[PDB]
Amino acid sequence: ASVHGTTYELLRRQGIDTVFGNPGSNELPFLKDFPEDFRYILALQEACVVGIADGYAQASRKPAFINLSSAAGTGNAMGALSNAWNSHSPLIVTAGQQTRAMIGVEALLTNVDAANLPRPLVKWSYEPASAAEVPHAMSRAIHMASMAPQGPVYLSVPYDDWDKDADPQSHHLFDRHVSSSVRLNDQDLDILVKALNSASNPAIVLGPDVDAANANADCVMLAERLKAPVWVAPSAPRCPFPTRHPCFRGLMPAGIAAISQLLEGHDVVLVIGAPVFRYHQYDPGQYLKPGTRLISVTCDPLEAARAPMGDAIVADIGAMASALANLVEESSRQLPTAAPEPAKVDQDAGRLHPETVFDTLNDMAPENAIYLNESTSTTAQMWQRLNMRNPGSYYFCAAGGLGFALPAAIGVQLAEPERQVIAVIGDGSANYSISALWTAAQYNIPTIFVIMNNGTYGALRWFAGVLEAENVPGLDVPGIDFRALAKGYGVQALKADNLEQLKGSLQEALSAKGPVLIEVSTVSP
Amino acid sequence: ASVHGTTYELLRRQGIDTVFGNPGSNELPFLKDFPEDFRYILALQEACVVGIADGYAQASRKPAFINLSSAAGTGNAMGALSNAWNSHSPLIVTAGQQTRAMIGVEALLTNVDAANLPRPLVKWSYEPASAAEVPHAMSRAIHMASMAPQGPVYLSVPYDDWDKDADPQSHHLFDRHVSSSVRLNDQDLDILVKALNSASNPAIVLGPDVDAANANADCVMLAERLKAPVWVAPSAPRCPFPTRHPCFRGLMPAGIAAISQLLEGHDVVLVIGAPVFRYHQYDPGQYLKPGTRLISVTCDPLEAARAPMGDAIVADIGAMASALANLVEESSRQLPTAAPEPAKVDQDAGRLHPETVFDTLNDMAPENAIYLNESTSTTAQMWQRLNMRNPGSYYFCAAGGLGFALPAAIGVQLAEPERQVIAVIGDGSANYSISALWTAAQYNIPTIFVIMNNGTYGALRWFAGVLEAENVPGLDVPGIDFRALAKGYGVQALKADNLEQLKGSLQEALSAKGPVLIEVSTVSP
Amino acid sequence: ASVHGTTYELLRRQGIDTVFGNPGSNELPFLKDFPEDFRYILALQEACVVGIADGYAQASRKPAFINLSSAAGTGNAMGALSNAWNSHSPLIVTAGQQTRAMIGVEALLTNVDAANLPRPLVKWSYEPASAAEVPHAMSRAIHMASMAPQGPVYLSVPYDDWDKDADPQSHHLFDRHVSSSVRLNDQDLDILVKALNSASNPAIVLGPDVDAANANADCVMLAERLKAPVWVAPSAPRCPFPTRHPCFRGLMPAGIAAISQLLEGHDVVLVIGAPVFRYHQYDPGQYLKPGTRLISVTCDPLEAARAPMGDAIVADIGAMASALANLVEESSRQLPTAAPEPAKVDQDAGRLHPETVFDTLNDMAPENAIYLNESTSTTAQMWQRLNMRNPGSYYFCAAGGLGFALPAAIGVQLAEPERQVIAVIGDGSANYSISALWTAAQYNIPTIFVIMNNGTYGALRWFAGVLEAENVPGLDVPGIDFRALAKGYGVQALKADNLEQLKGSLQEALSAKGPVLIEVSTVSP
Ligand SMILES: Cc1ncc(Cn2c(C)c(CCOP(=O)(O)OP(=O)(O)O)sc2=O)c(N)n1
Numbered sequence A, B, C: 001a002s003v004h005g006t007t008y009e010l011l012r013r014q015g016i017d018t019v020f021g022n023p024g025s026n027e028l029p030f031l032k033d034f035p036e037d038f039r040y041i042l043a044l045q046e047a048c049v050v051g052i053a054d055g056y057a058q059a060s061r062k063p064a065f066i067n068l069s070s071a072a073g074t075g076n077a078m079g080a081l082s083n084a085w086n087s088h089s090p091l092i093v094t095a096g097q098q099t100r101a102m103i104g105v106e107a108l109l110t111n112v113d114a115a116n117l118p119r120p121l122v123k124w125s126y127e128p129a130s131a132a133e134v135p136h137a138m139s140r141a142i143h144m145a146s147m148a149p150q151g152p153v154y155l156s157v158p159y160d161d162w163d164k165d166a167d168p169q170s171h172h173l174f175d176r177h178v179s180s181s182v183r184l185n186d187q188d189l190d191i192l193v194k195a196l197n198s199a200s201n202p203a204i205v206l207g208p209d210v211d212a213a214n215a216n217a218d219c220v221m222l223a224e225r226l227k228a229p230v231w232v233a234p235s236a237p238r239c240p241f242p243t244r245h246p247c248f249r250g251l252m253p254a255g256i257a258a259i260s261q262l263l264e265g266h267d268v269v270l271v272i273g274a275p276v277f278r279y280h281q282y283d284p285g286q287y288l289k290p291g292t293r294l295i296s297v298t299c300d301p302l303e304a305a306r307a308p309m310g311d312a313i314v315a316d317i318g319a320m321a322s323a324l325a326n327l328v329e330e331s332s333r334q335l336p337t338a339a340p341e342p343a344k345v346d347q348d349a350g351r352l353h354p355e356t357v358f359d360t361l362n363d364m365a366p367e368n369a370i371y372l373n374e375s376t377s378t379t380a381q382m383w384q385r386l387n388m389r390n391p392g393s394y395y396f397c398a399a400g401g402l403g404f405a406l407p408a409a410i411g412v413q414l415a416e417p418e419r420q421v422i423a424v425i426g427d428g429s430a431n432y433s434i435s436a437l438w439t440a441a442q443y444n445i446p447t448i449f450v451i452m453n454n455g456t457y458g459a460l461r462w463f464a465g466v467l468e469a470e471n472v473p474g475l476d477v478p479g480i481d482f483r484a485l486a487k488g489y490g491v492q493a494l495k496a497d498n499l500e501q502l503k504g505s506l507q508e509a510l511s512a513k514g515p516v517l518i519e520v521s522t523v524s525p
């Protein structure tokens, strides 16, 4: 067998059947004789390639495979990799390298010091020392991406390797099963369970690794047993809990003082599947108030190490959530009562308040819709206004890197063909990965894109106001016609200048057979 | 509180009470006002500092704290860090940096790009962005070193940071408890247990993380239940099993073909706490023979990812070994019978055969002796000839880096004051970290050093023979007087030119009140 | 031809004929069939290997070639590499890697992520992607080490590469000539010359790259023409000027305020071949006083970029010094008058003051002696008391990393067999690379080692006093018998407890046929 044949067999035996890519010369010897059982999903720029693959991996809860073009292709994707790192996305990023005979002279397309290029945004980065090593290196990449804490990995392959003879002993790679599905030993788990049972006023905080693990239902059971309020950890990349469940208390503010104030009076705070904590704004104060102790369950040693307070347990979130939910006592305390309905903001017949948009989406979207958020000034209102009953219903750029949601929404829709994906994206954010629209059109992936057009980088104007920072340049983005951009890439386009038009446009989009972009005229901050 | 006061409080609250170091200018502001409850152990060169700390950590099964002098001090220790990486040794390596005001100009003693210096031999490497961050960074270092898979970490601290005011919120760091004491979920563990119970001819292979976890006794129970032979994984850094137990089969040869041949006919091979596998010599063939399947339990994702065959489970070795030992059925098969006694090699009244030395050590040493090995051509015979009944009885440089055993033997003896440590070190190896002897003398740490003097780099002569490599320079090391070196550093010295003298010297050494070096004249290969 | 044959031919065609090494398994296929025209110099630990090679390179003014054993060997040398980086030493560091077939599994002796290991202390670091690339990679290493600014480089080679067929086109590598012997263009050089000619009170500061370039005599001519005082830049690794020439003003204090004060009243300060500046102690103030402007000529862009003041020119020091010396006008100003003789310190019949030792060395040593300094508390007095008329007469650890002088003195003596080398080394410093003594004995390299024994880390006690730092541990190093250590490694040993004995010992050492160590009892600080 050739290295080419052996590598594709390894991929298929490990459950990989799709290649997300943008091709180049160094990758042609890999992509040739492309297996008939594999799919290739082309995107027009590498931030888009990786964003699509990322959405696909996060929604499918399995690794996604990517193929990029040497250093420049890899480099174009590095902003996307920053998000993937923070979301623990299992991405296998491969890039083609020059033929071994031309690497020394640094021929055009040589990826110099290749393994260092994507650092520090990958768990493992490597270029094999010989062609016959390639299948083994691929095996390492697959497992490194897939083991807790999941994350992106990078493999660079000289293009002449693919046609070389494989080592017959590579067959031992094909069916390897590697598990990190582990939980705290019985003795210490019993101690934890007793602490939870004994708490007088427990609280629960959930992060994105809960949704990644599909631990949502177990966390619901845990919250109901403990009769505990449930918050989502700040800067949330995913939604880990049904947002209209009686215990739900919403998205935590991303500030030190704000969080300790919210947790005041709670004697035990159990954090599951989140960093402690992904703060953003400078909001100095106490990490916790006197009387509150914190216990974190995380899949990531780096998270456990850097928490400024609390105990921690490093384990698989699925295994831990299931064990805790099934072991804790049913508290005799009263179940928390549901948060009240959000207020209806006054809305005239002109430009749309974001609150109006979210209320309308919630009214019209199917109950199993999936939302993506890259409308950076409206996140708090989005979290209050969308009833998300099911797992896998929300994605937001985990490192705050714009250019995620547009392509990721296409990958999510590919992963979940029966769930309508609706990406709510600001006019500023829409540009970073605008060419991803083409992939939706070409493959007829029926994502709906809602562009919130207020003509400005609103979140930055807000932060500038907070800083009392005057005379900041570059905050306005006038003069973008999103319907024309959609037409440019072959996506049906609609405009909504008022509520009547928004309702009409959404009705049309929800009944469409392909992707649709709706440009919404929203109020200026 | 100052950063100095807060950091020492964090260290003591996290169980650290000893600093292994060689001091420099950038470290004086850390070392001043040294707490009266802490010990400082000086060594004269940094390979020695780190080797001592490494032995101490491995034997104590807890992190050891190191303080080195900027880049040059760190650099002098990097060979020692290579061993520590391979042995999963929990080492907190700190180094002083220039004052922040002088870093930009690159004043003398500036550690440039400090965090990159010890890579790739550390789990985490960092320099804090401000003085008030230092305690938090130290907390991260402690936990990163201590979490599975354990390993060395690096923290660089500008010397002006220590006198600055600490953040009062740093108190939340002091008592953090972080656990990685995890094992496979019940459902999948039951599957594993059933596979072991159903095996017709199981075999067990154990690596150093078993001894690190003190899982030895549980592995004995497991082997007795399964009625399975037990091998030690190749290139063994520690001894994970009693070497005269009936199931014990010794050290595996470090070759691909040799290992698959040894495992032939075993249907299930369970590897615990080892890489799969730390081969050395080129010995091509099948990774496993038809009919053999392999299951690896490892604490290290990097090990699980790179195994060329078998399934893997990434979990704590202590928790897994205990669970397996207590869950498996007692097989009705016959218990394996003990390996026969080693042959007595013919010995005249002249220079000592290594076999004679090991037999004599085994005869005379206490049953709870601890051995270290850096006699590179005699390892196989050492493993056959020493009855090591107890955990923590053997150490060998885990990355094959010479200069480990001499200082490590001092750290081990410090960790285990009631167990006689005997380091068996070749004449070549003895030189790498020779100045460590001084620390044994100064602190009266009563390690016994047995120098095997055959005048040559014997293992290299052997490998050259294997390669049929002629005209290799640099293989002979004549003209070293080890008694004089011992005298130079204040250690009692004895010579053994024959068996009578070896017995006399060992009797003297075993009754001595301080460290003793015995130079043994061994046969030339 | 084989890669082995082709690589040794490249080395010899590029002027390399000596390998400094400590061998290991991965290097045996390189070292076998060692060419009869090459020398191999063995040292017993890698800090010693690199120190010896460094002294050899610095004194010979040409690259030195080193061969180390995988990661652990490389790591043991990293403190030595820190000095080599700061001294711009052209060192070609090679290390053996595992066979390509065993790299993936990370067999024992695999150097993981090899090229990152010596960073940031090398100019270039690399592992070739195939065997046939090895000669080209070696060519790159040779030239990278040798081009201005000179420095260490690193090449990792899988051991199976050596026996493979070389590319016949590699012959084009053999005779490549690469020059960086460049100077400022005529127009701008004329501007510089006019500025120097027009200065009313110029001063000159010289650094180690002057001595490396053998630009010393040209700098003497320049100073005589400009009638300018000459200082040596702080933390001096080499001596760039005759120390009894009338213009000489000595070693600058390594402090910001001290230097600007010394330069006050000088309108133009010309710095040649030094960083601006290698300060050490914290001594805040003005970088330059009003009225002083600075112009730096440096071979190193990194130095030019980081200077906090002045203009800079990046060019070859030899070419620039020669051009300036020959272009400037002869000033009608009076030539500076020579510094007065140093005072004779009172000396009784007991332990030696360092001043006495240096005066005695100056009295007894040949006029072409070469000194090395690792007596850290006595540097200022050494610089005042040794008349060093010739180039290449002084070396001091350029990054302040101890363990340099003892091995470097052996390399310098090998480079300069007709010039008596005298290394003055503190009792503390002597231990870092003590085993280097063996190389001097084995190859009969007649270096004289003068150990200044005061029982303490004196420079650290001094700095602690400056910090008013109390209760610092680890500052005393009692109980070392240096005569016994010398005997241990086969070097003739003498002791000097008083001046009479010092004179007798020096007379004996200067007439000896081999290396000699003199242990001098010096006064305690
Ligand atoms: C790749 C990238 N570039 C720039 C930013 C900075 N940025 C920017 C430019 C924001 C404004 C986005 O504007 P929008 O139109 O998408 O949404 P809002 O008007 O609701 O803020 S929010 C923010 O953090 C970023 N996060 N990521």
Ligand SMILES: Cc1ncc(Cn2c(C)c(CCOP(=O)(O)OP(=O)(O)O)sc2=O)c(N)n1
Binding pocket: B079, B374, B375, B376, B377, B378, B400, B401, B402, B403, B425, B426, B427, B428, B429, B430, B432, B454, B456, B457, B458, B459, B460, C022, C023, C024, C025, C069, C072, C073, C076
């Ligand atoms: C730091 C370092 N340098 C060099 C080596 C190479 N090496 C060397 C030099 C060996 C010979 C050791 O000789 P010895 O006298 O200690 O023992 P034997 O004579 O029994 O081999 S074994 C080996 O791998 C190494 N492993 N580590």
Ligand SMILES: Cc1ncc(Cn2c(C)c(CCOP(=O)(O)OP(=O)(O)O)sc2=O)c(N)n1
Binding pocket: B022, B023, B024, B025, B069, B072, B073, B076, C079, C374, C375, C376, C377, C378, C400, C401, C402, C403, C425, C426, C427, C428, C429, C430, C432, C454, C456, C457, C458, C459, C460
């Ligand atoms: C590799 C390394 N380790 C530690 C130091 C710290 N250090 C040390 C330990 C000094 C004392 C040297 O003592 P000495 O006996 O050689 O000389 P003095 O007594 O004259 O200071 S000076 C100094 O910077 C260093 N520079 N380099």
Ligand SMILES: [Ca+2]
Binding pocket: A426, A427, A428, A452, A453, A454, A455, A456, A457, A458
């Ligand atoms: Ca906007």
Ligand SMILES: [Ca+2]
Binding pocket: B426, B427, B428, B452, B453, B454, B455, B456, B457, B458
């Ligand atoms: Ca030997």
Ligand SMILES: [Ca+2]
Binding pocket: C426, C427, C428, C452, C453, C454, C455, C456, C457, C458
């Ligand atoms: Ca001293």
Ligand SMILES: [Mg+2]
Binding pocket: A184, A185, A186, A187, B183, B319, B323
């Ligand atoms: Mg258990």
Ligand SMILES: [Mg+2]
Binding pocket: A060, A414, A415, A416, A417
């Ligand atoms: Mg699907």
Ligand SMILES: [Mg+2]
Binding pocket: B116, B117, B118, B119, B120, C116, C117, C118, C119, C120
């Ligand atoms: Mg490094």
Ligand SMILES: [Mg+2]
Binding pocket: A183, A319, A323, B184, B185, B186, B187
């Ligand atoms: Mg379970």
Ligand SMILES: [Mg+2]
Binding pocket: B060, B414, B415, B416, B417
């Ligand atoms: Mg103890």
Ligand SMILES: [Mg+2]
Binding pocket: C184, C185, C186, C187
């Ligand atoms: Mg010109």
Ligand SMILES: [Mg+2]
Binding pocket: C060, C414, C415, C416, C417
């Ligand atoms: Mg010469």
